[PDB]
């Protein structure tokens, strides 16, 4: 399971909480570092298997680079569609982890609230590792708390000082270029675009350089 899901406002929120229960002394940053482990899987697993959207995108390719499997761009102009609303944004940076060994698993059932089922399952699937550590259903529930908390205070009107990035996070199928032309297979992604959380299973794209 892809680590990159880690820097979203679902990441973000279980980062930020997780760091104060260290703080508090509630848990060791040790057992942080697993639950992120389990967020990972979580998130990679419930994006592979309850998201089903598919968005098309164009735009212009303004930078681009891979190393170590993983490809970032830099596109400016961009259009993103779905079934049939439309999104505008001067600038977008995508990161996109290679897919192509996930191929996750079987797809379970749509759900209504992506991200309260993927705190549900990371909540369950660490109250193990928390009882082995000392740490009780209460800690754990503070945990819950703390990570809904925050993931409320990200829709704040007034929570950002400035614009926010606008950054895809998602894997790739297939990415090609034909002389100037970019074609964009992309899967499993989480977008932030003018400060708003959308996801998608599938994305296709074209750029030009």
């Not at 973000?12 to 260290?22: F, R």
């Not at 639950?35 to 212009?60: C, H, M, P, T």
């Not at 297939?174 to 899967?187: A, E, Y």
Request: hydrophobic share 40%.
């Amino acid at each position: 399971a892809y680590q990159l899901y880690r820097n979203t406002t679902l990441g973000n929120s279980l980062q930020e909480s997780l760091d104060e229960l260290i703080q508090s002394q509630q848990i060791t940053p040790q057992l942080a570092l697993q639950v992120l482990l389990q967020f990972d899987k979580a998130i990679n697993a419930a994006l592979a298997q309850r998201v089903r959207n598919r968005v098309n995108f164009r735009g212009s390719l303004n930078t681009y680079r891979f190393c170590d499997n993983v490809w970032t761009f830099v596109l400016n102009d961009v259009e993103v569609r779905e079934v049939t609303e439309l999104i505008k944004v001067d600038k977008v940076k995508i990161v996109a982890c290679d897919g192509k060994n996930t191929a996750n698993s079987a797809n379970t059932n749509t759900v209504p609230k992506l991200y309260r089922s993927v705190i549900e399952d990371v909540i369950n699937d660490v109250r193990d590792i928390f009882l082995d550590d000392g740490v009780d259903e209460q800690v754990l529930m503070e945990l819950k708390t703390l990570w809904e908390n925050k993931l409320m205070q990200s829709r704040a009107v007034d929570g950002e000082l400035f614009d926010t990035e606008n950054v895809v996070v998602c894997q790739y199928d297939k990415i090609h270029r034909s002389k100037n032309k970019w074609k964009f297979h992309l899967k499993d992604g989480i977008m932030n675009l003018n400060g708003r959380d959308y996801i998608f299973s599938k994305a296709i794209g074209d750029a030009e350089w």
